[PDB]
Amino acid sequence: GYQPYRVVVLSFELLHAPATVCGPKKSTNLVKNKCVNFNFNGLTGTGVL
């Protein structure tokens, strides 16, 4: 009951700082001035730009 794994950990932070880290997908180009939803850098919302 002590077979080997070398423990591994999560990393995670709650908005308290600059945004820098996520695995890039298509990474679209932005529009403006038309109430459209955004998943902006992971932080999401709808409204205008």
């Binding site: 908005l15 308290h16 700082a17 600059p18």
Partner: protein
Amino acid sequence: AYTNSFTRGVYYPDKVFRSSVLHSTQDLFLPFFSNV
């Protein structure tokens, strides 16, 4: 040769930016009118 504080140790609490926000906080901060 101690020396009293008037107004020191005032720092925006985190990288976040509030804007015209009469806000409040609490963490390890500077006691006021204390003597350094």
